[PDB]
Design a protein around this ligand. Sequence first.
Ligand SMILES: O=C(NCc1ccccc1)[C@H](Cc1ccccc1)NC(=O)[C@H]1O[C@@H]1C(=O)NCCc1ccc(O)cc1
Ligand code: NA
Ligand code: NA
Length: 220
Amino acid sequence: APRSVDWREKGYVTPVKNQGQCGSCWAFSATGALEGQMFRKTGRLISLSEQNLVDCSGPQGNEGCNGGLMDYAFQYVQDNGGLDSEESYPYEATEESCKYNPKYSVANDAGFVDIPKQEKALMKAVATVGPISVAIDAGHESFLFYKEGIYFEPDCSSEDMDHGVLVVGYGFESTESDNNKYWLVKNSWGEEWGMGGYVKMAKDRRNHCGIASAASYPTV
Ligand SMILES: O=C(NCc1ccccc1)[C@H](Cc1ccccc1)NC(=O)[C@H]1O[C@@H]1C(=O)NCCc1ccc(O)cc1
Ligand code: NA
Ligand code: NA
């Protein structure tokens, strides 16, 4: 297996986005994972509509700006037979009626794959598939104010995750003394947050913040 992986250098990853004050993290994580897999299939990177998911995927069990799950989002695209582009169905950070238009669909999937709840299994997935949707425990001040380095929060929970994000890679870092391996994570709080919107999460440290507990990707 490769010791370092960064799917951004292969063209799989769109720029960082900003969910605003809508509880839609799960839809940004989902589009991230589907953007990657659509590029792997077609070689074309096209930003996907989170508003589409927020407004339309309630029947799959999502609750708009009040929360949701990436797997439910992947299920919607399969069930719906399409998902509109970001440009055709832009993000409003509020929940509304469904405005999906199949003429502007640019993506599809055939279900999804759940990764075993093991950081070694997530490593294999990231190395061979592409960006992977994961949930983390993000409810700590240290996460809000993160700037640089490998993020480690001693009070992080591996079993009570509350924020969907996207693992685009992993690697090693010796610029810091007390930690070394990290997962490279794309967040959805804009470019001002963290390291241009990304965070290095501690890897192989008691499944830190639960990053390997709810990992999945769509089938395309
Ligand atoms: O818990 C969740 N879903 C359960 C659920 C299921 C079905 C219907 C509804 C809800 C998910 C996290 C998840 C996703 C997949 C697997 C496990 C876990 N979170 C959400 O859907 C949004 O609430 C998150 C959000 O965007 N809030 C603002 C950002 C924020 C800021 C601080 C912070 O500490 C956390 C998040
Ligand atoms: Na291309
Ligand atoms: Na709706």
